[PDB]
Amino acid sequence: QSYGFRPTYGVGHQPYRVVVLSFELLHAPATVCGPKKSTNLVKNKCVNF
């Protein structure tokens, strides 16, 4: 059935876009992963590395 978009119509019939994101733990290596940015480096100071 044709949507019949109405630009002058109020809520409901106005174009609303919905997007989905499917996440699965398939038996694959790290492919889509976001790590943290590496901080600065220090020398000659006993720290946790």
How far apart (Å, rounded) are the C-alpha atoms in residues 32 and 23? 10
31 forms part of the interface with other proteins (CB under 8 A): no
The one segment of 6-14, 16-24, 25-33, 38-46 that binds other proteins by CB under 8 A:
25-33
User: Considering the rule CB under 8 A, would residue 37 count as an interface residue with other proteins?
Assistant: no
Question: How is 3-40 classified by DSSP, letter by letter?
Answer: ----TT--TTTS------------S--S-S---PPP--
Residue 32 in contact with other proteins, rule: CB under 8 A: no
List interacting residues with other proteins (CB under 8 A).
27-29
